[PDB]
Design a protein around this ligand. Structure first.
Ligand code: NAD
Ligand code: NA
Lengths: 384, 375
C-alpha cells in the first residue's frame, strides 16, 4: 500500500547533525490519566528532528519493512505538486498541522484509495470532516501528544504581551536602552483577569500554570469542569463566552476549529472586550476573524495579539498578523517542539501499527470513523 | 524645604498622552504578609508612567501644596550636573535603581541640608550607608514593591529561551515560516530540572510560578527555607552551588552580588553545567563573567542566556550580550513595569507623608536611621 506523508522543509542550512542537548525528559502519562503513546517499537531517539522532510517521522524502516511505498514530501500546493501526484492512490495520508496537507471535498473525491487520514499532532480541521464522513475515511490524531507544549507557549505569550517583552528585546538588540520606551506599556500580569475559551487539555494546563501568578481565573465551555477542579483553581465559569470576554484582561483561545468555533471572535465579539485586552490564540487562527483582529489591534481596542497559528499554512509573506502593532506571533511551532514531536511521532507509529494489524485505534485518537464523528471527534467537534 | 528627585528620561516621542489601558489591578498584600503601600492619598492614577521625568512620581501637587520646592531632573552624572548643583540644600533626595543618583561619601558631605534619602523602588547600593549615618540621614526604600514584577520577567525569559521564542518571532515578522528552523532547538520545559541561586522574595516567587510546569525544582542558598516550604514546592536543597548546576537544565540567578557570587558563573563553573543548559539572570550581571557567557553560547555549551541586568549599566551600545546568539535580553526594566511603579510610587508618597507629619516611617522601609542613631 502507499503511505503519502507531507512534512515541513528541512532547516535552511540542512538537516541537523547535532542538537543543543543530549536528552529530553521522558513523559509517560498525562494529567487526565491518559498514557503517552504506546507503539510496539520506535526507530528514532526522542529529541531528534522528526517533523521535517529528512526526519520522516521515523517511519521509513517500519513502512518499507512491511513492503509499503512511503512517499515523503513538503510539496503540497496545487495540481502539479508531489502531493497531488500521489493523492489518487494513497491508502493513508499523513500530515502535521504545522505544514498541513489540506483534504477538502475535491481532493477527497480524487483520493480513490484513501482509507486513513492521520494528523501527526492535534487538530484535524485541515481535513473537511463532512467529506471524510461521506467517503468513509477514518480520521485520527495523536490526542494529548503536545497539549502541554502548547500550554507553555501560551503562558509565555501572555507574559510577553503584558510585560512588553518583544519591543524591549528589540531596544536591547539594536544598541538602545530606552527604559521609558520599554515600560510605557509594560504591565505585571499579577491580579489580572485571565480567561480561557475551552478547558480541555490545553485550556486546563494553562489555567494550572497561571494560578500561581495570582490572576483571577475564568473559563467558558459547553460543559463544566468538576466542582473540585473549579474550587481548587478558583475558577469563575461563564455559560456564555460573551460574559467572560467582557471582564477579562487576557483571553486565551483553546478550542478546536469546527462550525461552533469558526469566527467566534469576530468584530462584534472583540468589541465586547475591555479596551486594552490581550488575546493569545494557540488553538486555530480561524476561531478569529483575521482582519477584525488587525483592526482592533490597530485601533488600540486590543493591546496585543499573540499566537502560533495562522490561516492558510504556511502563511503568505504579507499576512497582516506578521507586522500588526505589538504582535507576539510565531510560525506554527508550539506543538512541534522537539519534545512534542517525540510523542506525536510515537503515536503516529502506534496508530499505523494498529491499522496494519487490524487492531482498534485508541478511541482517544479517533475523530471520524465508520461514516460519523466518533471518539474524541464526537466529544469535541461538530458538523452542520 | 527642597526635594530633589532624579528620574529616567521620557519616551523618545514624548511623555504619553494615552495608555494601552484604563486601570490596573489593586495589589494589597505580598506573599510574606507584608501589606502593599498605604499612602493617605495619591495624585496619580495607577497605570501612569511615574518614573520618567514628566511623571514626577506624581508628587508635585502634594509637595508644592505644602510650600516645598520640587526639582525633577534626569541629569545626574558628575560635578556639573543639575543633580550636583541642587545637592547642597536638598532636604530630601529621591531616585530609583533604574536611574540612580549616587550618594557616595563626597556627595553626602556636600549635602549639608540632607535629612532623607528615599529610594523609589528597591536597591540603595548607590547610597553610602556609613556616611549617611555620620550625617544623621535616614535612608529608606519601598521594600517588597516590585519583587513579583521581577519574578514574572524571569519566568517569561525561562520559557522564551527553552522554547526558542525570539528567533521564531523574527521569522514570523520578516515573512518566513521556517518551522524546522524555529524548532531544531525548541523544547518543552515540562520535566526539566530548574534551579535558583538564592530563594528570597524573588527566587521564591519564581519557584512557585514554575511549579505547575511540572519541572523538578532545586535551590542553593546560604540558609534553607523551612521544611514545610521545601515540601510544599518539592524542592531539592544543594548546600554547594556546583552540585545544583551539574543537574539543572535551567538556572535562574536571584542572589545579591558580593565576593562569593562575583563571577560565580565563570568558564570553570559553566563547563560543569549540562551541555545545552540555560541561564536567566534578573539579579546582577557580574554574577556571570561577561565573555564566559558569550563564549559558551557561541560554542553551544549554553543553549541560551537572558536577563535585564548588565555590566556596566546602562550597557554600552556594543555590549556583546546584545547580539550574542540565542539571547533573550532586555534593558533594565523588570521592577519598573507600570504595575511596579504604581506600588513604589504610592510607597514614596506614604513615606513622605510620614516624614512631613512627624509619624514613623514603616520599619520595613527603613534601611538606616541616622536621625535615631544621632539621638
Ligand atoms: N501547536 C499548536 O498550536 C496546537 C497543538 C495542539 C492543539 N492545538 C489546537 O488546540 C485545540 C485544543 O487542543 P486540546 O489538546 O486541548 O484538545 P481537547 O480535545 O482536550 O480539548 C478541546 C476542548 O474544546 C472544547 N470545545 C469544543 N467545542 C467548543 C466550543 N464550541 N466552545 C468551547 N469549548 C469547545 C471541547 O469540549 C474540549 O473540552 C486543538 O483542537 C487544536 O486545534 C494547537
Ligand atoms: Na466569518
Amino acid at each position: 500500500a502507499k503511505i503519502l506523508c507531507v512534512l515541513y522543509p528541512d532547516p535552511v542550512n540542512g538537516y541537523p547533525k547535532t542538537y543543543a542537548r543530549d536528552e529530553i525528559p521522558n513523559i509517560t502519562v498525562y494529567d487526565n490519566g491518559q498514557t503517552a503513546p504506546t507503539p510496539k517499537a520506535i526507530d528514532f531517539k526522542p529529541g531528534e528532528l522528526l517533523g521535517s522532510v529528512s526526519g520522516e517521522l521515523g517511519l521509513r524502516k517500519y513502512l518499507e519493512g512491511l513492503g509499503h511505498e512511503f512517499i515523503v514530501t513538503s510539496d503540497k500546493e496545487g495540481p502539479d505538486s508531489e502531493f497531488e501526484k500521489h493523492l489518487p492512490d494513497a491508502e493513508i495520508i499523513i500530515s502535521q498541522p504545522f505544514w498541513p496537507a489540506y483534504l477538502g471535498p475535491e481532493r477527497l473525491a480524487k483520493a480513490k484509495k484513501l482509507k486513513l487520514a492521520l494528523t501527526a499532532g492535534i487538530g484535524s480541521d485541515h481535513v473537511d470532516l463532512e467529506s471524510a464522513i461521506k467517503h468513509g475515511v477514518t480520521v485520527a490524531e495523536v490526542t494529548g501528544s503536545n497539549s502541554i507544549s502548547v500550554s507553555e507557549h501560551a503562558v509565555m505569550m501572555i507574559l510577553s504581551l503584558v510585560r512588553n517583552y518583544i519591543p524591549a528585546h528589540e531596544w536591547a538588540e539594536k544598541g538602545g536602552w530606552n527604559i521609558a520606551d520599554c515600560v510605557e506599556r509594560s504591565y505585571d500580569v499579577e491580579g489580572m483577569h485571565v480567561g480561557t475559551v475551552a478547558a480541555g487539555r490545553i485550556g486546563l494546563a494553562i489555567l494550572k500554570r497561571m494560578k500561581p501568578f495570582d490572576v483571577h481565573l475564568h473559563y467558558y465551555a459547553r460543559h463544566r469542569l468538576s466542582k473540585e477542579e473549579e474550587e481548587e483553581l478558583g475558577l469563575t465559569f461563564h455559560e456564555n463566552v460573551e460574559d467572560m470576554v467582557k471582564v477579562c484582561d487576557v483571553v486565551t483561545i483553546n478550542a478546536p476549529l469546527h462550525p461552533e468555533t469558526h469566527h467566534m471572535f469576530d468584530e462584534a465579539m472583540i468589541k465586547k472586550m475591555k479596551r486594552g485586552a490581550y488575546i493569545v490564540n494557540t488553538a486555530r487562527a480561524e476561531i478569529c476573524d483575521r482582519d477584525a483582529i488587525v483592526r482592533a489591534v490597530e485601533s488600540g481596542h486590543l493591546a496585543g495579539y499573540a499566537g502560533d497559528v495562522w490561516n492558510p499554512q504556511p502563511a503568505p509573506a504579507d499576512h497582516p498578523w506578521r507586522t500588526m502593532p505589538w504582535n507576539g506571533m510565531t510560525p506554527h511551532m508550539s506543538g512541534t517542539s522537539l519534545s512534542g514531536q517525540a510523542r506525536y511521532t510515537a503515536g503516529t507509529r502506534e496508530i499505523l501499527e494498529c491499522w496494519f494489524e487490524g487492531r482498534p485505534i485508541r478511541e482517544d485518537y479517533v475523530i471520524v470513523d465508520g461514516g460519523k464523528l466518533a471518539g474524541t471527534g464526537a466529544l469535541s467537534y461538530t458538523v452542520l
